[PDB]
Amino acid sequence: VRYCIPGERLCNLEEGSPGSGTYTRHGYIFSSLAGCLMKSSENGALPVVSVVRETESQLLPDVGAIVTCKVSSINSRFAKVHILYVGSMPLKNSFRGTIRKEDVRATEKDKVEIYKSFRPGDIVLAKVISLGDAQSNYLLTTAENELGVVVAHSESGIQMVPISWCEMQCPKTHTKEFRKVAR
Amino acid sequence: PVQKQASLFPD
């Protein structure tokens, strides 16, 4: 174990290769961060050096993921969300995703309707597909019956229960709201 | 250069 510093060299190119958090100058590698270094080894015997600030080491929500999020803004076209839990490990770096109109149910019907599936201020979980290019806009999908809304607060302040596939109700009083209930 | 102690932010 050794903690490194943004100026100190680490190794020749002949004794390793840059993985991340480094840079190269004449015949040498030079760190670029205050953190811990690690030289992984492939079956090829040539090491890959890298440097990490394990405070927030690294996370990546990949395609076949199951990620929760919160519905902030909506439109007749799409509904935007913020990423909270990638799997079960939260991430203070809240990424921002989107859910399209058709990419809401496995049936793919155009008859779907956002305002009867989602509302601003409820938690869902979905599967990402596209990472995004410019703004890293995650595009999430809920084309499955065990997906979508799980918790949803009532007209004013009550948490509702997922009665059926597209119905939810508050336990205190009686009122049938419409969402894309999960499971 | 030798060091000193924090007159303001000791640890």
């Binding site: 510093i5 958090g21 205050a34 953190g35 | 250069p1 000193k4 924090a6 007159s7 303001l8 932010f9």
Partner: protein, 252 residues
């Protein structure tokens, strides 16, 4: 009258100017000497990275509000706000300033842009905020070093660290270059200078100077002297960062 601060008096002059005395002169000392340095990174909590540096009567903070969305055009930015607390220095100045704060801010930006690599921070602006709690000598150099520490702490990428050093000139008959001076050696001085470099690759990043006088050879000797001082200072900062990283490893 400012309507965003408390109604104080129109004007207010300090008492010192109404004093009657010949202030004490330092005298003699080892020109190639350095003050005792206390540098620690990781002080502040609500900031992605922070650093604190004390060298004599000098006491400086620096914080780094990290990447905040805002090739050669999709290249990062860093905007630096230098600011001396109104309770530093013999005289008081309203918080705003507008004369020398901005000059030293330009200095910080010109000395940091080189070290930092901004290709890896596109469409982003790093808000660096320095604060000078007490002036006791070389100030701009301490601020450069502290901003470097805070950046390296928040984990922004770089090429090397930034080490500063301030020099003055003795107005005596045999003028010698005084290294890392005090506010007294600096107000009773003829010329002042400030170097800042990246010691691994041995490259200046931003310097500055001024003079009641001087000459080429003298300025050159000053430069090399400041370089040697920064070299001799670097290891302290290294150890400070290592220590903060160890504390992080301890927390989890």
């Amino acid at each position: 009258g400012d309507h965003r601060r408390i109604r104080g008096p129109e004007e207010s002059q300090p008492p010192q100017l109404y004093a009657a005395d010949e202030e004490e002169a330092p005298g003699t000392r080892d020109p190639t000497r350095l003050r005792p340095v206390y540098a620690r990174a990781g002080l502040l909590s609500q900031a992605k990275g922070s650093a604190y540096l004390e060298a004599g009567g000098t006491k400086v903070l620096c914080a780094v509000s990290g990447p905040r969305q805002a090739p050669a055009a999709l290249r990062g930015r860093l905007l630096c706000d230098f600011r001396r607390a109104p309770f530093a220095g013999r005289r008081r100045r309203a918080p705003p300033g507008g004369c020398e704060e901005r000059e030293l801010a330009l200095a910080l930006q010109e000395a940091l842009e080189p070290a930092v690599r901004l290709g890896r921070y596109p469409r982003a602006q790093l808000e660096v905020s320095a604060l000078l709690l007490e002036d006791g000598g070389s100030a701009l150099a301490a601020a450069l070093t502290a901003a470097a520490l805070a950046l390296a702490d928040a984990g922004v990428e770089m090429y090397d660290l930034v080490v500063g050093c301030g020099l003055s000139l003795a107005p005596g008959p045999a003028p010698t270059w005084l290294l890392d001076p005090t506010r007294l050696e600096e107000e009773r001085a003829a010329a002042g200078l400030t170097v800042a470099l990246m010691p691994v690759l041995n490259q200046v990043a931003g310097l500055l100077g001024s003079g009641e006088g001087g000459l080429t050879e003298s300025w050159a000797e000053a430069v090399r002297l400041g370089l040697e001082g920064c070299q001799r200072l670097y290891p302290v900062l290294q150890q400070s960062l290592v220590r903060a990283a160890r504390r992080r490893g301890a927390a989890a």
